[PDB]
Design a protein around this ligand. Structure first.
Ligand SMILES: Nc1ncnc2c1ncn2[C@@H]1O[C@H](COP(=O)(O)OP(=O)(O)OP(O)(O)=S)[C@@H](O)[C@H]1O
Ligand SMILES: Nc1ncnc2c1ncn2[C@@H]1O[C@H](COP(=O)(O)OP(=O)(O)OP(O)(O)=S)[C@@H](O)[C@H]1O
Ligand SMILES: Nc1ncnc2c1ncn2[C@@H]1O[C@H](COP(=O)(O)OP(=O)(O)OP(O)(O)=S)[C@@H](O)[C@H]1O
Ligand SMILES: Nc1ncnc2c1ncn2[C@@H]1O[C@H](COP(=O)(O)OP(=O)(O)O)[C@@H](O)[C@H]1O
Ligand SMILES: [Mg+2]
Ligand SMILES: [Mg+2]
Ligand SMILES: [Mg+2]
Lengths: 314, 338, 322, 477, 255
């Protein structure tokens, strides 16, 4: 077998779907070649690493194997590496087209020690005539302030719904899969922006149950069913909600964190109730979540959360 | 000025004869002195009592002490330092300069001092800013080393101290000086400083307006003597510090005008007060009591004031950005008073 | 000589209970030979470790001591460990090995985000020469990438039939008699963790083995577990709902003192009892749940015990007024 | 080799000492110290000439990142015609390696400086050394015994030894306490940076709105390299400053709109879209929402809830979101709490007090106030470290009680006694170990009716000169 | 581009190992006259120049002048491989991104070609003008190396004196002091034991110990080392070669 996320990974910059502004920025960068040092920040699985990889590929053409140094969390990045190997790579003579430059792609820059990030400063400041640096990070706060200021910051928003839907439809058309609209909406729901997780859940559903259907997705996700949680959060009499939470969710060994997270996610999408009541229900569920994370996970906390949600809905 | 008239013995004390009698009693046992926990309001002179007790046990040379700096490495790769003022017989640890590394420094320093071998004294200032982990480490240190480290900790409102620590130490309290005794000390001061008083009513007036805080009373007497050319008459416009006047002007602006157009300037004044080394809890307490002092409000408004003040004081003690909670408290106050 | 927790540990796939839905799947995976990376996650005392060790011993037989590497949580777990040990074990190919190795990471939810990123990159790199198996208690503290990379397996708690079968097998292989209500109270208090059951059994064995023939009554089980008996809960609730303030306070105090009761478990039992009453109004239930949750949250930080007890009594009383 | 393919920071680097924007005083101080270091060496570094800058061997540069410290140091060393022997973080500056490499060259001469030009009478310092230790703060764990060895290098040296760091008051930088002179580079003002950006823009044949330039200079918090690097992005035009550069402003503009939270608009813009709008920038959105949530004319008010109640509830939710953010930053592994924070600090107050913007969206100011509070707390901590021997108080009660009367005793004589009270003033200053800098710091911490920045300059400068020249003769410790 | 064929592969190995400890990055300017190189110390105190004419190459063909800037640690790692009785060959292509070093055995087909990645260095090439040095002398390299290795065990500075046709080395450390003097003389029996001297002004200089210890490593190239000292100019140490020279320019100390 073969993972779809690995098989259908975009190799050309145009195939990347998502942020429309920064992808066009990188398109013009590859068209010109004068790429500056850049940090790329954003939430996981929204197309950070693939973006910089495609950029380097399209920018260097046939010389990618000789003019690119990649360093992820697997490779050793301490003090000796940044002082010896990176410095000897930056000085390496290489005759490229007039606009191109050697590229150093540092993925998961957050794991790089601050003391290790110190050494990179003069190494990237001095040899900026034949070497450019591209950091890829989740949180741009763990990068030291000097490196934070030396390079251009590129933020990647979380994926919307129409973009993930378009990508999934492309994948289905290329793979000739049987599906339905409710299944795709369930994929969008369980993904919430993670293109990688969306594609993986799609492939797992197709491999396990063949047909992309709501019950199949909700049986392969191992998460509480969104319909039953919505019924819990929308029952008229409180005892019905308490009985639902007791018998249908608490007995089957679900983790309280998962229950609160699913309630949060379904309350976000309840497009039938008003907006203010949604915000207040989210506030209550979030207070209950903060209580849960502090060490107490008794059923009484979820019962009180449901009670307060009903008190608000009345 | 004030430090020039600071007692240097239990006999030189001129206040709380019960307390000085009990300390003279306790100083009869230099070989067995239990741990002491002094608690009482600010400016009562607990540090004076502690240093006088030390002078009674040890020599009178305990008051000539030298400052020192000590830097150490933690479990991680951070090397941080503190400043301890030490004497030939005692040392004063003030775990206030450091934010969260109280436990490591207290553990290391106590374990290092407890291997010098007749014992040594460790004075813990601000015993309420100690994280519970640091407090537990201190209690275990007390449990281990008891023949070289006799702990004396001064603090105020000793609620953030776990009962495991209260059990081992002797709880001693220092009540604020009554207005009569404050007036007596002020009279002694103006006598030894030949200040030309027109009457003795100014002393009682200062004692009343000082709210039983001895050191701020002495210091405001100092501040007023240099504005009347050492001749204090009956018409004395009592001088308040700058931040108190700012807080009172803020209170008057809150009472007189109730709108967001004034809330902007209120936030500006809060920013200006905070950025000049002033805590949040002090601002909140002063603003609350000032708003309660105003005579135009009824009892329901005062009850709402104190309830919101309690809620936002809890939230200030739980949060980290004080301007948010202060602006929220003032907004709720303006809402209720509207 | 060794404790029952270590003695009665299963050694084959047949000696696991209440997990048939996963046992058939792992048997399909071992007969197919296409065993991918696995994630076993669930509440403690369920059989994840036992199942994976039995599966490894079945697949590799005697080569288990060579092609199976077990690693636990925070073994000096910097990025350096994932760079050296796991990476060498994955990359290095044995002299006479056919197939793939197995690296089982026990309680591997205590890894930092950087450590989990290193692990996901490693499993991505050498996914053709070895397969991994990650064990977890809470599947919400893992990076979604590592979760998506492998196949999930949730370990639902042990049902009543499985635990009853296991305690029967333990009983017939030991010198103990067990009363009818004893197993009922046992299953009610254990909540479905086999480890706690095998612990408390040998505990009450060593506790009441005076004539080698005493019967384990519910008293000794409630003592060894440190849980209240439902009769005391009903009695204290009755006293609160019926008597006045002083008598109810004294009753609560004596019940929580003479037996050693924590307010947390007492509140759990009290709300469990109140869950099945025929309350006519609704505001009573809402106020009760809210105030009791607030009491539990405040107890979680260790206030003044008597104050929280009086607050519990006041909430229960003021809730039942309609 | 090409004029274009170089970055915009290296291509537009300063060349003289009149293009360095901001901090002219510190540059002139460094230049006048380096020029007179020769005569200071002649006098064995014991005669402090007219500035107290004749006894120190090493100069130390510090300040926020992106001001020109490295550029100023290099240009000052080059103007005098010296030869720059530079070592930085990328070199292993251990104790043994420093003793081997640099220590043997503290007093030697240069070969390249000799052979470059030695016949024409330009300047006699064409062959001397100027050792620049850049990023001394960057001494990581792999450089053992570096800070102490450099502190020892400060003394016993024979050539100008410039040092550069980013945080002077860091404990690791303590061994540089009094053994070297230390000047400070402040964040440049908006006028000089605006002039430099205008020069660059007209030089690159493109014009921008001055308001956008002001917003940029505000966002970058005074960093010049950062704003230049961000401006270089214009070539790759409202889309540029709308999407990439001025993102938090547009986030605040979209969130505070009144048409979104309406029923007609909410059906087109879901709550998930607003949470994504927050996630766009989760570092500046809470502060931006808190700064200007009370400067809009609302339109979503309830029938019976005035503006004050709405702003009060918004501030309550802001406080709750602040608590949630603190809980999040207590342990990063709880990033799952990030969406909840999203609704508390960001979405809820905006939805509560949305409407139409009255004026213009003002950037957040909490960062500058936090920096000012940190600086003043450091100064007060130093003052207490000095005065603790004879006050018997805590670091916070000092500012509360003692500071007003201290200011009175230290200044008010200068208002009524004229200038003969200096012998008394220093007397008080001799009792509390205070210095002239301590006097300035004490004079600084005052707000309200007792503002001193206006009053301080009213006294005659002759009194200041006499006080300074009289304090120089005595020393208490 | 260029094809250079050494007669004995040990020659370039000794050349590189002679000064591989004073400079980390060196530039080799390949012209038609031969190979010229100059490199400054990392502390800008000790310059190293090297000239090797076409007479030292069995066959040397250069299409057009080029600059091969390579490391010395990697070049020493590569040159450490080949045996002595081989035929080293240096080859470079147009726009050289890497140099090729062939090792061929005369009586075998064992050809071993290695590749080395060239570095990029800013050509801070200063030009050296001949100066009339006051004192010019020449002495056996073993004698000078022994004297330096003996004197350096005392302090970190060595003082040289040339006065009235007398050479003097002096060292004064904390553990003691030491002094050596040399008188010029010559012997027809073995001219490799003669100490030449041509003095125009008595000169007194002081040099660093570590730099002299790094310089004396060149004693393996030749046996007669020449020294040129001036009153204030940097000292010149010269080791002659069958087709060229290796020169160390050393900067004096201050009083
Ligand atoms: N916009 C996109 N279009 C198509 N595929 C995408 C997109 N974004 C993510 N993916 C898929 O997601 C997979 C995961 O790779 P990346 O997105 O590069 O991971 P990442 O963004 O670096 O997140 P990390 O590694 O956890 S910080 C890719 O192999 C793609 O198949
Ligand atoms: N399904 C089961 N069937 C039979 N015995 C079991 C079962 N689960 C647990 N046990 C017993 O309980 C012991 C503990 O099992 P473990 O596999 O260690 O539990 P666990 O799944 O690893 O949960 P942890 O380690 O607390 S996270 C085993 O050695 C057995 O004796
Ligand atoms: N005053 C200034 N005017 C114009 N450009 C400046 C100025 N200061 C810095 N720069 C820019 O910044 C580049 C050099 O950065 P520096 O500010 O010298 O770095 P730095 O001051 O050492 O701060 P670090 O290294 O991050 S702690 C110059 O080439 C300019 O592009
Ligand atoms: N018995 C006393 N007689 C005279 N002055 C006193 C007496 N007790 C306290 N004081 C004065 O009170 C001042 C403040 O006391 P201190 O211990 O500094 O308060 P805090 O505990 O707030 O630091 C001291 O300067 C001291 O002069
Ligand atoms: Mg990535
Ligand atoms: Mg286990
Ligand atoms: Mg710099």
């Amino acid at each position: 077998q073969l993972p779809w996320v690995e098989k259908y990974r975009p190799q050309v910059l145009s195939d990347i779907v998502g942020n429309k502004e920064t992808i066009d920025r990188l398109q013009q960068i590859a068209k010109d070649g004068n790429m500056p040092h850049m940090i790329i920040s954003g939430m996981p699985g929204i197309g950070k690493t693939t973006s910089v990889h495609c950029l380097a590929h399209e920018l260097l053409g046939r010389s990618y194997a000789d003019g690119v140094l990649e360093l992820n969390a697997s490779d050793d990045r301490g003090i000796d590496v940044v002082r010896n190997q990176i410095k000897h790579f930056a000085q390496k003579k290489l005759h490229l087209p007039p606009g191109k430059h050697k590229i150093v792609i540092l993925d998961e820059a957050d794991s790089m020690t601050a003391g290790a990030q110190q050494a990179l400063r003069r190494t990237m400041e001095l040899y900026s005539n034949s070497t450019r640096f591209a950091f890829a990070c989740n949180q741009s706060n763990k990068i030291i302030e000097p490196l934070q200021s030396r390079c251009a910051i590129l933020r990647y928003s979380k994926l919307s719904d129409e973009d993930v839907l378009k990508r999934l439809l492309q994948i289905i058309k290329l793979e000739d899969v049987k599906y339905t609209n409710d299944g795709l909406e369930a994929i969008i729901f369980t993904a919430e922006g993670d293109m990688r997780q969306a594609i993986n859940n799609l492939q797992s559903t197709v491999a396990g149950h063949g047909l992309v259907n709501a019950d199949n997705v909700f049986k392969i996700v191992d998460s509480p069913h969104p319909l039953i949680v919505k019924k819990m959060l929308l029952a008229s009499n409180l005892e019905d909600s308490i009985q639902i939470l007791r018998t249908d969710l608490w007995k089957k060994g679900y983790s309280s964190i998962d229950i609160v997270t699913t309630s949060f996610r379904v309350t976000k999408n309840l497009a039938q109730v008003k907006e203010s009541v949604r915000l207040e229900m989210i506030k209550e569920i979030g207070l209950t979540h903060m209580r849960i994370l502090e060490g107490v996970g008794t059923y009484l906390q979820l019962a009180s959360m449901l009670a307060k949600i009903h008190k608000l809905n009345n | 000025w004030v430090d020039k008239y600071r007692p240097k013995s239990l006999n030189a004390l001129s206040h709380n004869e019960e307390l000085t009698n009990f300390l003279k009693s306790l100083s009869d046992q230099p070989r067995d002195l239990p741990h002491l926990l002094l608690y009482g309001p600010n400016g009562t002179g607990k540090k004076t009592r502690c240093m006088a007790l030390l002078e009674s046990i040890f020599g009178p040379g305990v008051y000539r002490l030298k400052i020192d700096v000590r830097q150490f490495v933690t479990a991680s790769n951070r090397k941080l330092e503190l400043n301890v003022v030490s004497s030939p017989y005692h040392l004063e640890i003030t775990p206030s300069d450091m934010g969260n590394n109280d436990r490591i420094v207290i553990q290391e320093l106590l374990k290092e001092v407890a291997q010098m071998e007749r014992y040594k004294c460790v004075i813990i200032n601000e015993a309420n800013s100690l994280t519970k982990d640091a407090q537990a480490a201190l209690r275990r240190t007390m449990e281990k080393y008891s023949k070289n480290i006799r702990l004396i900790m001064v603090c105020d409102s000793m609620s953030p101290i776990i009962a495991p620590i209260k059990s081992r130490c002797l709880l001693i309290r220092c009540p604020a000086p009554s207005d009569s005794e404050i007036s007596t000390i002020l009279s002694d001061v103006v006598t030894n400083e030949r200040i030309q008083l027109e009457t003795k009513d100014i002393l009682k007036r200062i004692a009343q307006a000082s709210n039983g805080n001895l050191r701020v009373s002495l210091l405001m007497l100092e501040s007023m003597a240099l504005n009347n050319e050492l001749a204090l008459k009956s018409s004395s416009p009592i001088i308040k510090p700058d931040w108190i006047i700012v807080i009172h002007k803020l209170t008057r602006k809150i009472v007189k005008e109730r709108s967001v157009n004034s809330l902007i300037e209120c936030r500006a004044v809060l920013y200006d007060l905070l950025a000049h080394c002033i805590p949040a809890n002090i601002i909140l307490k002063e603003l609350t009591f000032s708003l309660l002092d105003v005579e135009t409000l009824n009892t329901t408004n005062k009850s709402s004031i104190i309830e919101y003040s309690s809620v936002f004081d809890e939230r200030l003690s739980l949060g980290n950005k004080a301007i948010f909670h202060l602006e929220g408290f003032i907004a709720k106050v303006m809402c209720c008073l509207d | 000589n060794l404790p029952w927790v270590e003695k009665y540990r299963p050694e084959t796939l047949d000696e696991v209970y209440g997990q048939n839905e996963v046992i058939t799947t792992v048997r399909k995976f071992v007969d197919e030979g296409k065993l991918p990376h696995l994630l076993f996650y669930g509440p403690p005392g369920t059989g994840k470790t036992s199942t994976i060790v039995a599966l490894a011993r079945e697949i590799y037989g005697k080569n288990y001591s060579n092609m199976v590497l077990e690693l636990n949580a925070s073994d000096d777990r910097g990025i350096d460990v994932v760079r050296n040990q796991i990476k060498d074990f994955a990359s290095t190919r044995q002299i006479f090995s056919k197939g793939f190795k197995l690296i089982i990471l026990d309680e591997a939810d205590a890894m930092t985000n950087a450590a989990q990123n290193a692990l996901r990159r490693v499993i991505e790199r050498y996914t053709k020469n070895t397969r991994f198996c990650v064990l977890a208690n809470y599947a919400h503290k893992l990076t979604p990438a590592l979760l998506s990379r492998c196949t999930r397996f949730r370990f639902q708690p042990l049902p009543q039939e499985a635990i009853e079968r296991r305690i029967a097998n333990v009983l017939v292989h030991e010198k103990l008699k067990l009363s009818p209500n004893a197993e009922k109270a046992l299953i009610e208090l254990s909540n479905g963790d086999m480890r706690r059951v095998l612990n408390v059994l040998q505990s009450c064995k060593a506790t009441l083995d005076n004539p080698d023939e005493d019967e384990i009554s519910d008293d000794v089980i409630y003592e060894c577990c440190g849980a209240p008996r439902p009769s005391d809960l009903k009695a204290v609730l009755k006293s609160i709902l019926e008597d006045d303030w002083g008598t109810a306070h004294y009753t609560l105090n004596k019940v929580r003192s003479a037996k050693g009761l924590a307010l947390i478990d007492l509140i759990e039992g009290i709300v469990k009892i109140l869950e099945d009453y025929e309350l006519q109004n609704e505001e009573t239930r809402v106020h009760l749940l809210t105030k009791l949750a607030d009491i539990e949250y405040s107890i979680s930080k260790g206030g003044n015990d008597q104050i929280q007890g009086s607050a519990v009594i006041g909430a229960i009383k003021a809730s039942f007024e309609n | 080799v090409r004029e274009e393919d170089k970055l915009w920071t290296v291509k537009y680097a300063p060349t003289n000492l009149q293009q360095v924007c901001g901090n002219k005083g510190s540059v002139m101080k460094l230049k006048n110290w380096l020029a007179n270091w020769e005569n200071s060496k002649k006098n064995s570094f014991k005669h402090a000439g007219k500035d107290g800058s004749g006894v120190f061997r090493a100069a130390m540069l510090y300040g926020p990142p992106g001001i020109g410290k490295t550029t100023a140091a290099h240009l000052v060393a080059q103007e005098l015609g010296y030869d720059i022997l530079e070592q930085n973080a990328s070199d292993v500056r251990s104790k043994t390696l420093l003793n081997a490499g640099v220590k043997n060259a503290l007093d030697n001469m240069s070969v390249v400086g000799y052979f470059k030009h030695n016949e024409e009478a330009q300047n006699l310092n064409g062959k001397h050394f100027v050792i620049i230790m850049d990023e001394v703060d960057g001494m990581s764990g792999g450089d053992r015994g570096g800070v102490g060895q450099l502190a020892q290098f400060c003394r016993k040296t024979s050539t100008p030894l410039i040092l550069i760091c980013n945080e002077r008051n860091l404990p690791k930088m303590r061994p540089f306490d009094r053994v070297c002179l230390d000047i400070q580079f402040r964040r440049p003002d908006a006028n000089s940076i605006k002039s430099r950006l205008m020069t660059i823009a007209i030089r690159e044949k493109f014009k921008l709105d001055p308001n956008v330039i002001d917003r940029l200079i505000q966002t970058t918090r005074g960093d010049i390299r950062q704003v230049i690097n961000l401006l270089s992005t214009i070539s790759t035009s409202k889309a540029w400053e709308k999407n990439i550069a001025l993102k938090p402003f547009d986030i605040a503009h979209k969130m505070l709109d009144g048409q979104i939270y309406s029923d007609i608009g909410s059906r087109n813009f879901t709550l998930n879209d607003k949470i994504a709008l927050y996630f766009d920038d989760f570092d500046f959105t809470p502060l931006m929402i808190q700064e200007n949530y009370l400067s809009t004319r609302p339109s979503v008010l309830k029938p019976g809830q005035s503006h004050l109640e709405a702003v009060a509830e918004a501030a309550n939710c802001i406080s709750l979101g602040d608590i949630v953010e603190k809980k999040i930053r207590s342990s990063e592994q709880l990033w799952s709490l990030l969406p909840l924070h999203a609704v508390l600090s960001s979405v809820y107050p905006a939805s509560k007090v949305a409407g139409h913007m009255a004026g213009r969206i003002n950037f957040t100011a909490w960062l500058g106030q936090n920096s000012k509070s940190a600086k003043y707390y450091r100064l007060l901590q130093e003052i207490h470290y000095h005065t603790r021997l004879g006050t018997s108080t805590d670091k916070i009660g000092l500012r509360l009680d003692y500071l007003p009367t201290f200011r009175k005793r230290l200044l008010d004589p200068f208002l009524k006694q004229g200038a003969d009270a200096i012998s008394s003033v220093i007397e008080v200053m001799d009792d509390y170990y205070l210095t002239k800098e301590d006097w300035d710091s004490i004079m600084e911490f005052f707000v309200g009716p007792d503002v001193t920045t206006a009053i301080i300059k009213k006294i005659p400068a002759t009194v200041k000169s006499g006080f300074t020249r009289k304090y120089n003769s005595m020393t208490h410790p | 581009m260029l094809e250079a064929k050494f007669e004995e592969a040990s020659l370039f190995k000794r050349i590189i190992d002679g000064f591989k400890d004073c400079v980390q990055l060196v530039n080799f300017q390949c012209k038609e006259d031969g190979i010229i190189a100059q490199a400054v110390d990392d502390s800008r105190v000790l310059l190293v120049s090297l000239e090797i004419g076409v007479e030292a190459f069995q066959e040397y063909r250069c299409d057009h002048p080029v600059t091969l800037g390579m490391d010395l640690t990697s070049l020493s790692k590569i040159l450490r491989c080949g045996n002595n009785t081989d035929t080293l060959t240096l080859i470079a292509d147009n726009t050289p991104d890497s140099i090729i070093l062939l090792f061929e055995d005369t009586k075998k087909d064992r050809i071993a070609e290695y590749s080395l990645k060239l570095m990029d260095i800013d050509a801070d090439f200063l030009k050296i003008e001949e100066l009339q040095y006051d004192s010019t002398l020449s002495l056996p390299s073993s004698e000078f190396s022994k004297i330096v290795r003996d004197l350096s065990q005392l302090s970190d500075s060595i003082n040289i004196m040339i006065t009235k046709e007398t050479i003097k080395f002096v060292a004064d450390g904390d553990i003691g002091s030491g002094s050596v003097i040399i008188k010029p003389f010559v012997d027809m029996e073995h001219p490799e034991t003669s100490i030449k001297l041509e003095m125009d002004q008595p000169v007194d200089l002081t040099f660093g110990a570590k730099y002299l210890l790094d310089i004396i490593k060149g004693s393996s190239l030749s046996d007669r080392v020449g020294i040129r000292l001036s009153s204030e100019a940097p000292a010149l140490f010269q080791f002659d070669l069958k087709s060229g020279f290796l020169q160390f320019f050393l900067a004096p100390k201050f009083n």
